[PDB]
Design a protein around this nucleic acid. Sequence first.
DNA 1: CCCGTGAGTCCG
DNA 2: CGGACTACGGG
Lengths: 245, 244
Amino acid sequence: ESPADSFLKVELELNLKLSNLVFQDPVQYVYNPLVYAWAPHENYVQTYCKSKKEVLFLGMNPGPFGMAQTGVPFGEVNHVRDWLQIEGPVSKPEVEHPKRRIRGFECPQSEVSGARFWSLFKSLCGQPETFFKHCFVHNHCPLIFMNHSGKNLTPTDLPKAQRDTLLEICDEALCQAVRVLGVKLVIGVGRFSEQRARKALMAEGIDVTVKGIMHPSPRNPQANKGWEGIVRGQLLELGVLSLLT
Amino acid sequence: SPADSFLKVELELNLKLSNLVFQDPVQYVYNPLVYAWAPHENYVQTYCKSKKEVLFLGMNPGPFGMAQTGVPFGEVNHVRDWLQIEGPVSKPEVEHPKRRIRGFECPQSEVSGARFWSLFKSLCGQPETFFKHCFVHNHCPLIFMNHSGKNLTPTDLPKAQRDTLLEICDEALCQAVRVLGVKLVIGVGRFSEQRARKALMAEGIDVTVKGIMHPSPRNPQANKGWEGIVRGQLLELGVLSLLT
DNA sequence: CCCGTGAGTCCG
DNA sequence: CGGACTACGGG
Ligand SMILES: O=c1[nH]cc(CO)c(=O)[nH]1
Ligand SMILES: O=c1[nH]cc(CO)c(=O)[nH]1
């Protein structure tokens, strides 16, 4: 009963259905680090999904300087290389916007959401085995979208049409991964993810609770004030602190 | 070298460029450093035999000069007759029909190249004299058309296509200027002028960068007495002396 | 070409 | 409510 190989296959399944869609209009570039950063992604899943999980943290999509460069979700380079200890070759999506070049583990920029994310669990837990013992992390959509200028588009900033097909498809995948991991509880990082997961799972009556935490993005002011403080508090109300040690 | 190193720098450059891909408005792309390599390497072999003090730098080829001869500002009469370079020229994989490459048979004369080489002919007489201490090169070797075959400069390109290219063309420029020993770069036009200062100041190269007006007949100021303005600018920058 | 007047983005 | 940076059209 290791989910790794089935998680990875839910993901290659999902890469398939997505390779099929065509985007438009405000969208000019699309990148899926799940193709070009497969190696480190695999290595994450292999090393850290060796067994079934009670909790799943769930973010919305990769950001430009985290998962888009490392393949690990909330994948800020330094914490991924020094704490998770995941290395891997990464190549380059087929068309790059010059302001959003993939440099892999030689990325200079630090993604603030991801560094916050993992810096909390690194304080909470010490050692990655402790945090992954019962938990795991994953994103609802692995694709990353940019307009003509390099400006990032979330899935919600997408026009109606491609947006509903694309979420419909990730919603089904999300249900498989949840079943494969074996989880009792899911914490969306951010409102979009908590809602979306909720609506996904109840639509196939999967019997799992969906809570949330504050997103650590710096576009959100309450987060720049003491994200870790708030969240350590949100995880205590959810009853998960005993889980991570 | 620097003939041989200069060429290695250009062949590393083509290879980065053979990767990229364009679109949108860009429908054709030619590289005369591939189909016109021979007359380009004769040019270099003949006139880049020692280190240099000055580097004239244009922006990119035009449709009837370097696109046809593989020499920078390479208008066919001045190239064959004063510089004395000839060479087989083959053809781009996909030609726009109204811009077929015909090499040293091109009936069109590029006005820019004609002005530019004529000036130096009159100034220096014999090319060996021009190239005792100078050389000429373009920042970018590709040429671009749109569906109708009209020319797009690197400046006419959408931003995303343009930044990738130009940042692959800068490195090259640095490598080139470190290979020739150049102490002065003169951009032929504002665009190369500004582009090369940005670029050499960044690697912190020991080198000045100045500018002369561009000959293109698209520039209204260049249509009356370009030759006479550029002789003035060149006098200020003080290189009339090295030009004998 | 060469320049001027100006919109899109970022400010973690 | 700003400041700095860095597509297109007329000459
Ligand atoms: O800036 C320019 N203009 C025109 C030519 C002609 O081929 C050139 O080589 N460089
Ligand atoms: O003589 C020329 N030279 C250069 C051009 C530029 O495309 C032209 O149209 N006519």
